[PDB]
Amino acid sequence: MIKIAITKGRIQKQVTKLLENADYDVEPILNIKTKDDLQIIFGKPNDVITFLEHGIVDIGFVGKDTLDENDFDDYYELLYLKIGQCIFALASYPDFSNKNFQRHKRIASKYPRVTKKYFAQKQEDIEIIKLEGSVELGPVVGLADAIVDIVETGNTLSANGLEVIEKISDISTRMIVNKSSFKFKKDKIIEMVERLEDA
Amino acid sequence: MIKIAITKGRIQKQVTKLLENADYDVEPILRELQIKTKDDLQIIFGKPNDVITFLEHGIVDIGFVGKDTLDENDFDDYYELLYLKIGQCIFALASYPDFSNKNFQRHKRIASKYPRVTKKYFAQKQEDIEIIKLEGSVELGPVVGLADAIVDIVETGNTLSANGLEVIEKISDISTRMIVNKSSFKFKKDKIIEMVERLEDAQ
Amino acid sequence: MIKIAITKGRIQKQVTKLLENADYDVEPIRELQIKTKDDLQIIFGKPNDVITFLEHGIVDIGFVGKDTLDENDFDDYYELLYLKIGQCIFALASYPDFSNKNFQRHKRIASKYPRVTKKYFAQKQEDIEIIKLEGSVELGPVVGLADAIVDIVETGNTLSANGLEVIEKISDISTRMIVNKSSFKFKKDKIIEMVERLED
Amino acid sequence: MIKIAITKGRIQKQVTKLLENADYDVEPILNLGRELQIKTKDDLQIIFGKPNDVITFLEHGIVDIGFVGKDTLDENDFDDYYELLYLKIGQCIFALASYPDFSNKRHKRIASKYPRVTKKYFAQKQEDIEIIKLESVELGPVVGLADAIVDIVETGNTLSANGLEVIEKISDISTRMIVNKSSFKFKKDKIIEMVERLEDA
Amino acid sequence: YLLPEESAEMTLNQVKSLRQIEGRLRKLFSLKNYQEVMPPSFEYTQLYTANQEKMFQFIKHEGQSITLRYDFTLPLVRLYSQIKDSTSARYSYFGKIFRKEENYQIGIELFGESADKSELEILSLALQVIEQLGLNKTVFEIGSAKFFQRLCQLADGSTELLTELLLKKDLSGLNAFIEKNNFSKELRGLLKEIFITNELSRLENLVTNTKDDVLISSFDQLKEFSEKLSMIKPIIIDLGMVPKMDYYTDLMFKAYSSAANQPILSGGRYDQLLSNFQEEAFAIGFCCHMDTILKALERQEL
Amino acid sequence: YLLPEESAEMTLNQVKSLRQIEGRLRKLFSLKNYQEVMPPSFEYTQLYTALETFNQEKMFQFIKHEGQSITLRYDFTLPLVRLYSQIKDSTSARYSYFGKIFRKEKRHKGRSTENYQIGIELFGESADKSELEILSLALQVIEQLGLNKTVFEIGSAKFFQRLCQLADGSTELLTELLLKKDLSGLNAFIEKNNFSKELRGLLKEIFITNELSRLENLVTNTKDDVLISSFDQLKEFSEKLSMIKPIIIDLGMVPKMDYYTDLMFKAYSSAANQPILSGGRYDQLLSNFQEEAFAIGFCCHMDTILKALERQEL
Amino acid sequence: YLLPEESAEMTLNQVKSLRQIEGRLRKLFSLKNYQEVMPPSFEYTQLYTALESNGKTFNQEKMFQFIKHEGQSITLRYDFTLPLVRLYSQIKDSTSARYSYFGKIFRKEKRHKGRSTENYQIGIELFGESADKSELEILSLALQVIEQLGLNKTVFEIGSAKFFQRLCQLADGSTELLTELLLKKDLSGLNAFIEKNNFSKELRGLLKEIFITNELSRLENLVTNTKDDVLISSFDQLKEFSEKLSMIKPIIIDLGMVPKMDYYTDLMFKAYSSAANQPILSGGRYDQLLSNFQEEAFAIGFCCHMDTILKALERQEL
Amino acid sequence: YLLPEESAEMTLNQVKSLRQIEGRLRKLFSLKNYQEVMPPSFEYTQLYTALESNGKTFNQEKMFQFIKHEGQSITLRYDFTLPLVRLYSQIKDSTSARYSYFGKIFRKEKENYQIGIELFGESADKSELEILSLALQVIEQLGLNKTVFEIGSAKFFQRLCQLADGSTELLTELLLKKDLSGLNAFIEKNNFSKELRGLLKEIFITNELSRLENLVTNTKDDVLISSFDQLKEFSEKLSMIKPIIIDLGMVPKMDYYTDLMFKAYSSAANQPILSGGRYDQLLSNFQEEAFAIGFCCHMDTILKALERQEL
């Protein structure tokens, strides 16, 4: 059949949404097959990629933010549900842009790769500090001058006195496919890709 | 004042509980990042590894994390002053029954959320393996054939049985612990030792 | 004064010849470090020793042959004068049939000069296997230890007196006047004065 | 036949001597005309050349037997041979020469023609040095180029004539007859024969 | 005990498969007059000029930088250089390369032979080789570096960008890309297609419609190969193929097995490398990645 | 343009001869049920540098990402022994290998840096049975190489060691004497100690003769058990195999490695200065990992063998 | 534009401070007759690896290594003490020797944490001099050195490996266990330990106490009650130092201090700043090291962690 | 024990000398308002090999390197100038900048302690006099008894090579070995004027300002008479500090040397004790065009020379 893997997050809703809005047997029960013959698995983003990587599945639904930071790259990014409004951005205190830093900028982010790559292009050297969650505390508690995180409505930031100092990239869910699968199952794969792109 | 960092999860309740039973003010009960109590304690919340970070950098004097996180995490410049016992979790190497015999032409591939631990346990057993990092429901590791056995945190043993898995061996005991900044303990031993006493009797 | 070093060989003659033939005092008695009226303290020894001496600043000037300088690893010197006195030459010697012989293997060359030999076949765009022999390289191909040799051929007799013949010439050899760089820098006067007086 | 290699110098005489005393046809006397390969009536094909050239000719199996001084063998790294016979004709040795005051006074720099040996001797003394390769080793300390030297001292003449004295003896040096291991396994006959005869004188 | 993360370990059975296949491939190769050559294990880091990070290296006593055999093609090309009189040459090789991450390879190189004749010879032989491996399901694809480049120039010449689009088959990125540059209806229709189809009928049209010579030209060449070889095995033309090395002249090909993610065989034309030592000639050969074929034979079995 | 020094170069023909010989040996080995194994290209330098010919100076090394020091395959026996350790099923095991090891050699000497070898290992099997199987196979391996004149030699590490104890225990000194067959040095050695005559008549003899009859006497006259015992063992093998090929006993043979248990052998070709084949028993290595077992095997020096096949042709 | 992560980037001011402090410490050391030495940048990995001991330092993983021409494995300067101790071996005149060093060692740390891989240290080594004289000379100097660092709130702590050792022997010889307990001031683990055993009331009182107090009066009691000679003896020595130097700066006695390295002979001391989590200075006596080369001799010294000091001078400033 | 043949060992004395000189040179530098910078010990192999030459790739043979866990090639401090040039890039406000440095680089050759300064941003004329003046003052703190200071021009060198049938690769080798005879063989294979010949033969062996000035002006080449004149001025403005020597036969070390270049030597040592020059080119590798000039003191050679001298 066709094996899929979905990120348990808010993405799992975007997918089940599109799948249904494209005519596919859906059932949100707890932990799975479908009539359309789609074996589906769920888990965290880095685990969706891990599963697709080890050819455990053929298709996967993850976010650009995960695909960017993740060092894995051996996949095909066919479809792209532009459904959303998240974006990578360098947030900080208003005065950030004006304050002169003698020493290098300390940035706290959940995505060190994305942060190191953004500042690469900006021709600036920084010191990255890894934080797994509420990166807002980073600058608040005094661990970093600024942060690089996913900003959507801007609320979390504004509710701490921070503000988007500059946008990096737009975040959204992507349908990634295992290269080997695409090559020998190009059928069902392309079909679904079309059935989901008009949906 | 005394700066504390508590791991947002289930541990956030264990600590808050113990803190009340210790005669300490409770504001955490009911969207702020860092707050202050009447006992002159400024508390911060977040994931385990963020609590250790905040401690490593002296962002806070005290912090509460699980032994599992301390076992995994490579930081080691702290003091483990208090040790709660509000926990029956343990580090286990789970798998399928037949597991204990199979002859692999390959290096066994264990999947776990704690690769540093997993790697340490198999080190002593003199056996080299292949670790597959899984951030979440580590059970599917052997279910979808992704890996053979797993090294996760086993407690009631339910998540294991509900998937046809059983403990192949117990690695160690896991429990919430109170860690302290070596420096903070040298310049604020007073209040530090004091809170230790108070939380000690709370159990 | 001006310290010199000369190769005890055939070269030592080429020097005393020019020296004398240059109005320079020449008193040859053996010993190792003597003085002269022109204030020229001289020392004698083997080519690679002249160089070793000139290298360690034991002397300022030194006389040796291109063949020694080419093979030697040393390079930090000034080759000011060049007595185009001899007629020796580096050449690839071997038996007549060599050119037309078709080995399906790499050519084994025996030479007293590995570096000069490797450098030559480098420009020749050919890979070989060098066999270091300190003496009569002619044996090399005779006893059957190499298909050819790379050595210093002058009159071409030694080769011809073994059925060997030059297969190609590599470079013209000759005695050279080399000066230690630091000396030239702080004794540029005398050094150049002598250089000119020897260039006639 | 037996292929032999003899070191063209002083040793060439020592050997020629022992060979006639062993009653072997001696024709290396009447031929020095750039001849480096010859045959005797004893069915011996002899070749001459420098020490190292002899060892080479041996190692490659160009010849079965070769004669070289112990010094060369101590220096040279080749080691796949048999030291069957050991002449005693000479009284040469490996010594650490220098100036009298030497044993008292950065890093000591020794100049020798046997760097591998020099490096080996000081290796045991636990002292680390700087070797200066020279192909008249006496001038080493004379022109200040080096402190002491590790050369072959015999009559102690060259040393004194330059005001140098042995600071210590390294080892005894004498001509030796080495054999090619392979050649000994397929011609042990003649090989042992010749050893007998050569040993007799 | 432990083992270097770079040291590989083959099971006693894998060695049997590996040795079996070679035995088969050796007959085939020697049946086609291909001589086996065993390149040195050490080479001058300099030679590998045509990323030193993936190389095992070192200096010598002499004082130079040497590298463990990192590639099989270069050495053999050097060897073809040595040959005085310019004649044809067929070399085969059976060994491994050293990179940082077994890497046992089996390949062949064709030098000197006439152009068109060589391309069929090598393509033909690559198809025979695949049919000696024992892999049940495999596809063989051909591409053209000339068609690749011509495609990058006409695409506002943004070669570096499109190269990244094609590699990830970033359909959406492509769409945005075709947006920023007002591309002709034809070039558009083509770029969107070559990304996800190999249906010869569909692609032929798209290509001819661009009315571009160099493109229709290169497509036509692959179309022939497709037809002349189609009997041996169904060929697949991938116009979205990204040349594996910057020196690929034109023809290039990969072969895959449903049992493995990497290609079991890859190769192509690269007259460029021949110029580094000697003068212009026809140089073409392929390489079989044994570690991947063996892996595939295993999975397939289950 | 040109190749480095450390790189070896085989002629197209040479490759044919090498591959020819492998084909034959491949049938021979598999016909005796010897499974081929292909040890990893790199090993942690540790593994090697734990055995005193194991001098780091001859090994090619570099640092791995993790920061450790790894080395290019330097020996085939070690890895194959490790492989035997992995198996808990304490059973018999026959391994074979075709490939090369990498060691450092001096330039311009004509020495080989890349060394192609073909060899086998026998682990587990009973003592008696093994020693005859290996010796037997080795002999068969030797008709397969187109070498005309070749000699096979057997020796004992036990007899050697016994000889070094009775000789005032100056092993380090007599080892060098035996290696260079320093008759003169030996003589000066016999003088400095009160050695028996029977030990003296022995020492002087084992250096230059392999005559079974002559040796047999000398040995028994020493009335030493260990010595006569080890000599008899060699005598048997000499007899049991004497039909396949004439075996030569060398009582003056010095064990290659310090771990050589007892039996040991070499095989020379009149057209090669280095042995074409060599091996022996070494149960000790086994104990470096698992427990005591009875190892043994040999290795074929292809670089030497082909060089011989060439000279031999002229 | 961008630099590796293993590279540290010092600000222009930080360099000024560092050089300021050096200027001062150089006067100080030179005035006390200490000769500065510059150890080689590379060492044979052998030199460092030889040393395994509890605390946990000489582990091949944190070292930058590479292969030298001869083919041996060399390592980037990892330690300053070892090379200075070797230098002392070279000396053919068994006399006193005072050494100093100003430079950096290179250890590997995990990425994405202000962990420095480039560590600048300043320290001194005392070799040969008599036991008592040395211990006072070094402790004294160390205190002076702290007075040159512009740090406001700093505590100095002294201890005894001998008391630590003696304590382990009496605690059921459980050294491996007690070391981890003391390191983490594992109060809960210690309690569980004391219950498993049959320790005298005195030893139990002591153990529980040395984990959380340095009140000289209280400690002196608990120690004498154990009526252990070795224990009271070792505590008395610390007490003397506490008194002889109490004038220069109030010393603190830590009987719960775990010897850093396994070769640490007896006296050992640390120094902290309220402005940093790491010690600004540490050191002690380790005659043992001197044995790996020449014979037995009193060897003692200390080292300044300038990165920690500059990092503390900055926090302090705010 | 034995020590790695890559590791250097300074005596307790040499360290005192080194530290004395530094203290003195530190007063001098800070007195001239040069800020000290401490470049990182690790760099990306890319930086170096890249910005060092052109034509056939610079070599990483002399560099100590290793891979990172991120999997990149990093190199131990190999050069002090490059990193300081980068530091200047990162200041946006285009202003003057004086940096100094005191440390060692790591190179491989069958410590390598250095002291130097860099001048970025300042006007052209002002800088050249500043650097040259400063170098002279540094030489007068070393304590070396006999030392020469040589100035050259890369612009002169280049013009010369162009006029010489553009055989820059060949004439460079001739000048390097002051190969008088080969030079000769060179002049008779070409069709050079009398002037160019007279000059080529002379610049190889004399610094006589009077000898030189004539030869140059006779060539009636504007670029050559201009470059010489610029060196001649320096010679005059600085002479009172110390006699300056003009070496028209000087071969620019680096291919990026703009014009002025200078070396300082001590009779007691073969290598130069101080070398520097102008290299605006390097600045372009980052930001835009500036006037970068500096010099480097080779402490190892200076200390080596102080010892020999002592005897």
Coordinates of C-alpha atoms in Angstrom, one line a residue, chain C residues 104-106 114 118 127 129-130 132, chain F residues 1-3 5 9 11 13 108 110:
Chain C
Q104 CA 54.9 -3.7 -19.8
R105 CA 56.2 -2.7 -16.4
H106 CA 57.6 0.6 -14.9
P114 CA 67.2 10.3 -6.8
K118 CA 62.6 11.9 -10.2
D127 CA 56.4 7.1 -13.8
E129 CA 61.1 3.2 -9.8
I130 CA 64.3 4.7 -8.5
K132 CA 69.6 4.5 -5.0
Chain F
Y1 CA 51.8 12.9 -14.0
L2 CA 53.6 10.7 -11.4
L3 CA 52.7 8.5 -8.3
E5 CA 56.4 6.5 -3.2
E9 CA 52.1 -0.5 -9.2
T11 CA 51.4 -4.6 -14.5
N13 CA 50.0 -9.2 -16.5
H108 CA 64.5 4.2 -3.1
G110 CA 62.7 -1.0 -3.9

